[PDB]
Motif scaffolding. Structure first.
Motif, PDB file in Angstrom:
ATOM      1  N   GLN F 279       0.824  -1.197   0.000  1.00 34.26           N
ATOM      2  CA  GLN F 279       0.000   0.000   0.000  1.00 34.26           C
ATOM      3  C   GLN F 279       0.861   1.251   0.000  1.00 34.26           C
ATOM      4  O   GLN F 279       0.585   2.195  -0.741  1.00 34.26           O
ATOM      5  CB  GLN F 279      -0.911   0.026   1.221  1.00 34.26           C
ATOM      6  N   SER F 280       1.912   1.280   0.820  1.00 32.77           N
ATOM      7  CA  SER F 280       2.780   2.451   0.839  1.00 32.77           C
ATOM      8  C   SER F 280       3.626   2.577  -0.410  1.00 32.77           C
ATOM      9  O   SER F 280       4.104   3.670  -0.715  1.00 32.77           O
ATOM     10  CB  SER F 280       3.714   2.420   2.038  1.00 32.77           C
ATOM     11  N   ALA F 281       3.858   1.482  -1.109  1.00 22.64           N
ATOM     12  CA  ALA F 281       4.768   1.477  -2.236  1.00 22.64           C
ATOM     13  C   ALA F 281       4.067   1.754  -3.544  1.00 22.64           C
ATOM     14  O   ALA F 281       4.558   2.525  -4.369  1.00 22.64           O
ATOM     15  CB  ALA F 281       5.479   0.129  -2.331  1.00 22.64           C
ATOM     16  N   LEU F 282       2.918   1.157  -3.763  1.00 28.40           N
ATOM     17  CA  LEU F 282       2.448   1.111  -5.126  1.00 28.40           C
ATOM     18  C   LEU F 282       1.685   2.351  -5.520  1.00 28.40           C
ATOM     19  O   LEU F 282       1.573   2.626  -6.716  1.00 28.40           O
ATOM     20  CB  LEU F 282       1.613  -0.135  -5.352  1.00 28.40           C
ATOM     21  N   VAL F 283       1.202   3.133  -4.558  1.00 31.16           N
ATOM     22  CA  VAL F 283       0.673   4.431  -4.939  1.00 31.16           C
ATOM     23  C   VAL F 283       1.797   5.349  -5.387  1.00 31.16           C
ATOM     24  O   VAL F 283       1.665   6.054  -6.394  1.00 31.16           O
ATOM     25  CB  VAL F 283      -0.166   5.039  -3.802  1.00 31.16           C
ATOM     26  N   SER F 284       2.949   5.288  -4.731  1.00 28.79           N
ATOM     27  CA  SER F 284       4.095   6.056  -5.178  1.00 28.79           C
ATOM     28  C   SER F 284       4.806   5.383  -6.330  1.00 28.79           C
ATOM     29  O   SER F 284       5.819   5.894  -6.803  1.00 28.79           O
ATOM     30  CB  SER F 284       5.058   6.300  -4.023  1.00 28.79           C
ATOM     31  N   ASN F 285       4.342   4.218  -6.747  1.00 30.04           N
ATOM     32  CA  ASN F 285       4.771   3.676  -8.021  1.00 30.04           C
ATOM     33  C   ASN F 285       3.848   4.042  -9.164  1.00 30.04           C
ATOM     34  O   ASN F 285       4.310   4.203 -10.291  1.00 30.04           O
ATOM     35  CB  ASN F 285       4.891   2.169  -7.922  1.00 30.04           C
ATOM     36  N   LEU F 286       2.556   4.185  -8.908  1.00 39.00           N
ATOM     37  CA  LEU F 286       1.658   4.461 -10.017  1.00 39.00           C
ATOM     38  C   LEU F 286       1.786   5.888 -10.520  1.00 39.00           C
ATOM     39  O   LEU F 286       1.576   6.129 -11.713  1.00 39.00           O
ATOM     40  CB  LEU F 286       0.220   4.152  -9.637  1.00 39.00           C
ATOM     41  N   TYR F 287       2.144   6.848  -9.664  1.00 40.19           N
ATOM     42  CA  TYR F 287       2.381   8.165 -10.244  1.00 40.19           C
ATOM     43  C   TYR F 287       3.702   8.226 -10.980  1.00 40.19           C
ATOM     44  O   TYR F 287       3.782   8.835 -12.049  1.00 40.19           O
ATOM     45  CB  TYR F 287       2.341   9.303  -9.220  1.00 40.19           C
ATOM     46  N   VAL F 288       4.737   7.570 -10.462  1.00 40.00           N
ATOM     47  CA  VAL F 288       5.998   7.609 -11.177  1.00 40.00           C
ATOM     48  C   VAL F 288       5.913   6.723 -12.426  1.00 40.00           C
ATOM     49  O   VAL F 288       6.752   6.825 -13.323  1.00 40.00           O
ATOM     50  CB  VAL F 288       7.124   7.273 -10.180  1.00 40.00           C
ATOM     51  N   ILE F 289       4.877   5.891 -12.538  1.00 42.62           N
ATOM     52  CA  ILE F 289       4.410   5.480 -13.858  1.00 42.62           C
ATOM     53  C   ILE F 289       3.809   6.662 -14.605  1.00 42.62           C
ATOM     54  O   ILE F 289       4.204   6.972 -15.732  1.00 42.62           O
ATOM     55  CB  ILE F 289       3.404   4.323 -13.752  1.00 42.62           C
ATOM     56  N   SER F 290       2.850   7.342 -14.003  1.00 43.57           N
ATOM     57  CA  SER F 290       2.105   8.305 -14.795  1.00 43.57           C
ATOM     58  C   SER F 290       2.713   9.701 -14.786  1.00 43.57           C
ATOM     59  O   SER F 290       2.009  10.649 -15.137  1.00 43.57           O
ATOM     60  CB  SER F 290       0.663   8.371 -14.317  1.00 43.57           C
ATOM     61  N   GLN F 291       3.985   9.874 -14.393  1.00 46.02           N
ATOM     62  CA  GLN F 291       4.641  11.134 -14.726  1.00 46.02           C
ATOM     63  C   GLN F 291       5.057  11.153 -16.183  1.00 46.02           C
ATOM     64  O   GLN F 291       5.439  12.205 -16.700  1.00 46.02           O
ATOM     65  CB  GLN F 291       5.897  11.414 -13.895  1.00 46.02           C
ATOM     66  N   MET F 292       5.031   9.994 -16.836  1.00 45.81           N
ATOM     67  CA  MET F 292       5.338   9.931 -18.252  1.00 45.81           C
ATOM     68  C   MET F 292       4.268  10.646 -19.059  1.00 45.81           C
ATOM     69  O   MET F 292       4.567  11.281 -20.076  1.00 45.81           O
ATOM     70  CB  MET F 292       5.454   8.471 -18.671  1.00 45.81           C
ATOM     71  N   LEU F 293       3.022  10.593 -18.594  1.00 46.79           N
ATOM     72  CA  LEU F 293       1.986  11.441 -19.154  1.00 46.79           C
ATOM     73  C   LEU F 293       2.083  12.873 -18.669  1.00 46.79           C
ATOM     74  O   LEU F 293       1.276  13.701 -19.094  1.00 46.79           O
ATOM     75  CB  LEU F 293       0.594  10.900 -18.825  1.00 46.79           C
ATOM     76  N   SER F 294       3.026  13.192 -17.786  1.00 45.05           N
ATOM     77  CA  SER F 294       3.207  14.585 -17.408  1.00 45.05           C
ATOM     78  C   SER F 294       4.288  15.252 -18.242  1.00 45.05           C
ATOM     79  O   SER F 294       4.430  16.477 -18.195  1.00 45.05           O
ATOM     80  CB  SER F 294       3.555  14.709 -15.929  1.00 45.05           C
ATOM     81  N   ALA F 295       5.071  14.471 -18.984  1.00 46.40           N
ATOM     82  CA  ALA F 295       6.069  15.064 -19.860  1.00 46.40           C
ATOM     83  C   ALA F 295       5.437  15.804 -21.024  1.00 46.40           C
ATOM     84  O   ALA F 295       5.990  16.801 -21.493  1.00 46.40           O
ATOM     85  CB  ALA F 295       7.007  13.987 -20.387  1.00 46.40           C
ATOM     86  N   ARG F 296       4.288  15.342 -21.496  1.00 44.26           N
ATOM     87  CA  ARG F 296       3.630  16.030 -22.590  1.00 44.26           C
ATOM     88  C   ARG F 296       2.777  17.187 -22.095  1.00 44.26           C
ATOM     89  O   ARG F 296       3.113  18.357 -22.297  1.00 44.26           O
ATOM     90  CB  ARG F 296       2.728  15.064 -23.341  1.00 44.26           C
ATOM     91  N   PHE F 297       1.702  16.862 -21.397  1.00 42.29           N
ATOM     92  CA  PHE F 297       0.513  17.693 -21.351  1.00 42.29           C
ATOM     93  C   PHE F 297       0.574  18.694 -20.207  1.00 42.29           C
ATOM     94  O   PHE F 297       1.561  19.416 -20.056  1.00 42.29           O
ATOM     95  CB  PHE F 297      -0.707  16.780 -21.223  1.00 42.29           C
TER      96      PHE F 297
END
Lengths: 29, 62, 228, 59, 120, 426, 61
Positions: F279-297
């Protein structure tokens, strides 16, 4: 594992990998 | 709005004392036996050491 | 080798007369027979190896004598008293002795060797080497401990010189000679008097592949002179 | 508590005070049909019973 | 004691492996020169010169040797006596030790043929 | 939802354990043969697409299983683990009902196999996405089915730790051990081929003179792993097994039998928080997955409330990041305890109905006051059991005695609970 | 762990009392623990502590 073939089965799988790995590599070099 | 903090901080100091606090015997057993159990899962890394980098040399070289 | 083996028989404590009575002869008479020869000349008085072997002979002959006395006497206090006396005289002998102490590398073979001198050298007979050695540490008799020390030492010495490999040339064949003759003996034991329907049956083709290797590696590497 | 049958409330009070460094409002004994004098012991209102209960082990 | 036997078999592959190549140490496996395209693939055990090894060659050889010998130890120490579980444990023991023996000798035979180019 | 797919999907099951019930050491034989397999299983694949990065989740992914672009370890037991976990979720969480007929538990294992193999197929497709795509898929399932059989023949079989957790443990022993002796280095300012091994800090004594500055590089090595790091790593292991033995004892008169006292315990680690840390790990893994969608938009301004501050200097240049990181860690594990226990068992009603269901009644009072007997333990031994893990992982980061940190503390905690599970069946 | 008669013989009177008290305390906690399950490991001590208590009292008398 009433029987030991599951292990033997795993060994067979590795052999299939083991032999089939170099088997295609036979024609290559 | 401040008192549930008091509740949990006193609530902790309740159940710390109710626990059994193991001594030199059970600590010893799970200590040595489970470091042994660790290294059962452990040397496996030394065997992907011994294998999967030299066969990666086989991979890249050919 | 020979006296320091004897040193081992201090610590395992397996002395007898019939170690000692045979050991004094080939030691002391052998020293004079070496003394006849020039290359080892007055060297058997003086070089750091057989000098320490002489010190070991002296401690061995003392420890035989010590065993003889003090077995007629009790374990009294006074054997501890002249034990102190004789120990101080022996240690002052040790002090007087310690005070008075009086391209080949390149040639490709004296350089160190790997398994090729090894298993290329000694194919099946590497495998069986611990086997009889385990048997030699199983039925650790009086004679066999000498061969165990001889299995240690020549392994240590054919670690650095492949030319010295010849010293390990029969050692391996000794204990592997035991090892198969253990395995074979235990496993033609069981049946004619299915595990032995494998374990005998491998050992032919397991071992005789050896005699293929021995037939022919002799033809490959070593069937070529130096002058032609 | 369970208490020794020979005890007075006075003794119990004095024991409870001595052992647990506590202080009592009142002791209120009976005898169980079993033989073991039970004792209900009201602690004075400066003290909480659940707190001492946790100290002595029980909860 | 048998701990002395443990010491000796510990020393066995230790001085079969690389005490000779402690001072003559040759680093683990890379020797390909692009072969046609791909630059520095690590090759193998050394093959062309016989006396040389690397660290990775020696350790493998040593490992192959002591497992075979201690497989024979296991044949002696448990398979010849008859005391434990007479249908389940024993059959495992002869099974994996025979696998040790056969495949070990087979692979070491391979690891002398391919670095050695010997007529088999 | 269960009544239709489960009766048809029965293809190629496993054989249940025999009538050779009680034994000491052939148990260990069935362990050791699987350990021979994971000698072997971590070995090279047969396809020559030599892609540059080994795996994309290679580090975290590597921590779980380390044959990244490697062997038949199949980049993880993540099929069996994830498929087991959400199965036990959707059994415990009543989105899907509970099966307690033996047909339903058998087909429950069948659906376990189903989601496991489907997830193997998913990982296969998602790693391979040239024209050489044949037979990879055949290999993976064969090596997925093998890990399946080896795990389920080490639950109903030998199984004491698990099949799973001891695989993870031994492969972690190996991942320390390649760092312990390290033969190769492809050829810094001085000192090749020695990076934080003890062999490195034994070869280092053989090369260099001035052994004082041989000690200094051995104990205060920064860029590579350190041996002070390894002392702190060992130290953390010792303390965490000091805290696993924290348990609450509750004796129980069994019903209808005179005075057998098999006291139910409540350990503080409280399923060892394999939810709660992950629980403590994978929420901070899912955004560092989805910072890749922060490079564009990004790795800058979003990081100040995203990550630990990584610095051994405790007074490093931002106390905001340190305070918010530690407070989030503590609060996250505590909050996910107090929310977690309600689903995967061992909440107040859970314990009560299991004990009534196995005929065990507390001595002090009536059977359905057992709730109020133990409701004053389980939430706090959730919450504190949450809390002083995360702060404990603070001590896994504050001092760098951890080979991998938090996660290593907690996966060996998995192993420690795992040993209890295996021992249980003796 | 073991309290013997051996040593107690020589000890001072006040020292013997403190020891008895400290056992009487230890006995209490085990008796408490016997009620609340405790553990077999604790419920051994209760017999041991009792006899060590006696060993002390005996020496005194």
């Amino acid at each position: 594992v009433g029987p030991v073939p599951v292990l033997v089965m795993s060994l067979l799988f590795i052999a299939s990998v083991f032999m089939l790995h170099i088997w295609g590599k036979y024609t290559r070099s | 709005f401040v008192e549930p903090s008091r509740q949990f901080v006193k609530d902790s100091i309740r159940l710390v004392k109710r626990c059994t606090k193991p001594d030199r015997k059970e600590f010893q057993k799970i200590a040595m036996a489970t470091a042994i159990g660790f290294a059962i899962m452990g040397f496996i890394g030394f065997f992907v050491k011994l294998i999967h980098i030299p066969i990666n040399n086989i991979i890249v070289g050919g | 080798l020979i006296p320091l083996h004897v040193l081992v028989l201090m610590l395992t404590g397996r002395f007898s007369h019939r170690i000692y009575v045979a050991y004094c002869t080939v030691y002391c008479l052998g020293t004079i027979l070496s003394m006849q020869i020039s290359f080892v000349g007055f060297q058997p008085v003086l070089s750091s190896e057989h000098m320490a072997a002489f010190g070991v002979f002296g401690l061995c002959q003392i420890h035989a004598f010590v065993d003889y006395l003090r077995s007629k006497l009790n374990p009294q206090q006074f054997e501890v008293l002249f034990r102190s006396v004789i120990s101080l005289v022996g240690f002052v002998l040790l002090t007087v002795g310690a005070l008075l102490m009086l391209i080949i590398a390149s040639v490709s073979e004296h350089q160190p060797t790997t398994w090729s001198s090894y298993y290329f050298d000694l194919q099946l007979l590497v495998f069986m080497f611990p086997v009889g050695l385990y048997y030699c540490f199983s039925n650790l008799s009086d004679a066999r401990i000498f061969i165990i020390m001889y299995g240690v030492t020549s392994m240590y010495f054919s670690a650095v010189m492949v030319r010295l490999m010849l010293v390990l040339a029969p050692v391996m064949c000794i204990l592997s000679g035991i090892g198969v003759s253990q395995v074979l003996s235990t496993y033609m034991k069981n049946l004619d008097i299915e595990v032995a329907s494998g374990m005998i049956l491998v050992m032919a083709f397991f071992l005789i592949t050896y005699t293929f290797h021995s037939t022919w590696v002799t033809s490959e590497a070593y069937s070529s002179p130096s002058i032609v | 508590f369970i208490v020794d049958v020979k005890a007075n409330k006075h003794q119990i009070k004095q024991a409870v005070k001595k052992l647990y460094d506590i202080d009592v409002a009142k002791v209120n004994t009976l005898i169980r049909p079993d033989g073991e004098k039970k004792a209900y012991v009201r602690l004075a209102p400066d003290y909480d019973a659940l707190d001492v209960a946790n100290k002595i082990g029980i909860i | 004691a048998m701990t002395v036997y443990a010491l000796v078999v510990v020393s066995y592959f230790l001085i079969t492996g690389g005490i000779i190549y402690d001072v003559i140490v040759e680093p683990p496996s890379v020797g390909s020169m692009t072969d046609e395209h791909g630059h520095q693939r690590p090759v193998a055990f050394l093959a062309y010169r016989v006396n040389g090894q690397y660290i990775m060659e020696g350790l493998a050889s040593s490992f192959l040797f002591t497992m075979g010998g201690l497989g024979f130890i296991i044949l002696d120490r448990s398979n010849a006596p008859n005391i434990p579980k007479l249908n389940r444990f024993l059959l495992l023991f002869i099974g994996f030790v025979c696998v040790l023996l056969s495949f070990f000798m087979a692979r070491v035979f391979m690891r002398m043929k391919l670095p050695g180019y010997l007529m088999g | 939802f269960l009544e239709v797919i489960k009766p048809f999907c029965v293809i190629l099951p496993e054989i249940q354990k025999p009538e050779r019930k009680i034994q000491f050491k052939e148990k260990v034989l069935w362990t050791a043969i699987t350990l021979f397999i994971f000698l072997v299983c971590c070995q090279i694949p047969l396809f020559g697409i030599m892609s540059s990065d080994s795996a994309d989740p290679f580090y975290w992914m590597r921590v779980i299983l380390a044959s990244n672009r490697g062997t038949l370890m199949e980049l993880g037991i993540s099929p069996i683990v994830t498929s087991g976990l959400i199965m036990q979720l959707l059994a415990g969480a009543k989105i899907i009902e509970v099966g307690d007929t033996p047909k339903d538990r058998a087909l429950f294992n069948g659906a376990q196999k189903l989601f496991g193999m489907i997830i193997t197929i998913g990982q296969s497709i998602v790693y391979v996405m040239s024209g050489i795509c044949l037979l990879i898929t055949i290999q993976l399932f064969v090596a997925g089915l093998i890990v399946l059989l080896l795990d389920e023949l080490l639950q109903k079989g030998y199984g004491l730790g698990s099949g799973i957790s001891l695989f993870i443990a031994t492969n972690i022993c190996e991942t320390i051990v390649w760092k312990a002796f390290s033969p190769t280095t492809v050829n810094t300012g001085r000192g090749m081929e020695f990076e934080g091994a003890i062999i490195a800090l034994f070869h280092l004594l053989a090369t260099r003179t001035d052994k004082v500055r041989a000690l200094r590089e051995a104990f205060y090595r920064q860029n590579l792993p350190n041996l002070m790091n390894l002392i702190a790593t060992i130290f953390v292991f010792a303390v965490v097994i000091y805290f696993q033995g924290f348990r609450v004892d509750l004796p129980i008169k069994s019903a209808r039998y005179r005075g057998q006292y098999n006291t139910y315990p409540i350990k503080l680690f409280y399923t060892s928080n394999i939810p709660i840390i992950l629980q403590s790990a994978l929420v901070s893994n899912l955004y560092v997955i989805s910072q890749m969608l922060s490079a564009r938009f990004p790795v800058g301004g979003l990081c100040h409330y995203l990550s630990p501050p990584e610095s051994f200097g405790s007074v490093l240049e931002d106390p905001v990041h340190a305070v918010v990181y530690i407070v989030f860690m503590l609060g996250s594990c505590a909050f996910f305890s107090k929310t977690w226990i309600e689903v995967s068992g061992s909440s107040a009603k859970d314990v009560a109905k299991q004990l009534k269901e196995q005929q065990m009644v507390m001595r002090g009072h009536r059977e359905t006051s057992m709730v109020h007997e133990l409701n004053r333990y389980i939430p706090t031994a959730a919450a504190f059991g949450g809390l002083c893990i995360g702060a404990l992982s603070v001590l896994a980061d504050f001092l760098g005695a951890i080979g991998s940190g938090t996660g290593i503390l907690l996966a060996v905690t998995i192993i420690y609970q795992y040993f209890e599970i295996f021992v249980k069946e003796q | 762990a073991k309290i013997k008669a051996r040593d107690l013989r020589g000890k001072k009177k006040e020292e013997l009392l403190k020891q008895l008290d400290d056992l009487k305390v230890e006995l209490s906690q085990l008796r408490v623990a016997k009620v609340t399950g405790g553990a077999a490991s604790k419920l051994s001590k209760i017999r041991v502590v009792r006899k060590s208590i006696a060993r002390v009292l005996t020496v005194i008398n």
